[PDB]
Each structure stands twice: as C-alpha cells, then as structure tokens.
Design a protein around this nucleic acid. Sequence first.
DNA 1: AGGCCGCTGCTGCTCAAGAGGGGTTCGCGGGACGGCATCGGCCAATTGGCCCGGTGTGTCGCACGATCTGG
Length: 85
Amino acid sequence: MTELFQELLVEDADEELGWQERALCAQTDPESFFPEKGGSTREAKKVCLACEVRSECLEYALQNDERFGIWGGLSERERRRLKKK
DNA sequence: AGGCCGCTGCTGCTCAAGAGGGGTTCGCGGGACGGCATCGGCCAATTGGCCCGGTGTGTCGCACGATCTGG
Ligand code: SF4
C-alpha cells in the first residue's frame, strides 16, 4: 500500500546522528517502558520486538549498565543474568 | 629723555656583578580521617493472567427454499 517503494528514492537529508533516531519507542509512550508499582512488561516487549535497532539498544544499555526500565526487549533481571552469564 | 601711536617683521596654530640573609609560597607527598557507594537476600503487594459459571446479542458456517436475471 503506502510503502513509498521502501523509502523511495527521494531523500535530501543524507545525514544521520546515530541509532537513536531509528528508535521505535520514541513513537510511543515513554511511561509504559518503566512499569511502576507492580506493572507489566509484555506490551512494551512486543513494541521492542519490532524495533529495527534492538541489538544496538541492548548493546548500549549493557555497556552503560542501566538497572532500570526495559531495553532491547529485555527487563532488568534478564540483563542481569546475561551479564552474570 | 620717557611715554605713546602706529608700522613692520617674526613666530605660532590649524585645514588639507656578584654574594649573603630571611620570610613566604607552593608543591609534592603523605597519610589519616570520615564518609557514602556497592552487593547477597525477600516477601507479599498494585497491575495483569486465567479461568468457572450463567444466559443473551450478535457475527459466521453452513442447510432448505423463493425471486430474478441471464444463458
Ligand atoms: S529496543 Fe530499545 S530503542 Fe528499540 S523500541 Fe525497545 S527500548 Fe526503544
């Protein structure tokens, strides 16, 4: 349908700062990614599943070692066990 | 001979080598002190699963059956 022939051939920016700009969650409620009280961690996991820079997000999160929120489709203890493994 | 009334020339301002003695800085270190930063547990708390148990209302999968248009 309205796919623009996979981004088409009309582009003038020819400039990218980094993989932040390709983040899908930026098009989405930030609050849902930090479940307070008990919360849930599956809808935002589904959102991350379709992210095109999931690997980069996971790598950056692990390298900087944030212990809050859900990054790369994984929550805190998945990151912790991956770090410990 | 002094005072004074003019002339007349001149000048000036402006537009284009050690040596000693003493208080102070800072500069390294140098370590001591106190403090805040990091890591096993840990249980019973909101959301959200995950279902029983009743019908109904309303979509969908297909049976009998009538009307109508084309073949
Ligand atoms: S993987 Fe990272 S960048 Fe992608 S949507 Fe999830 S949190 Fe955002």
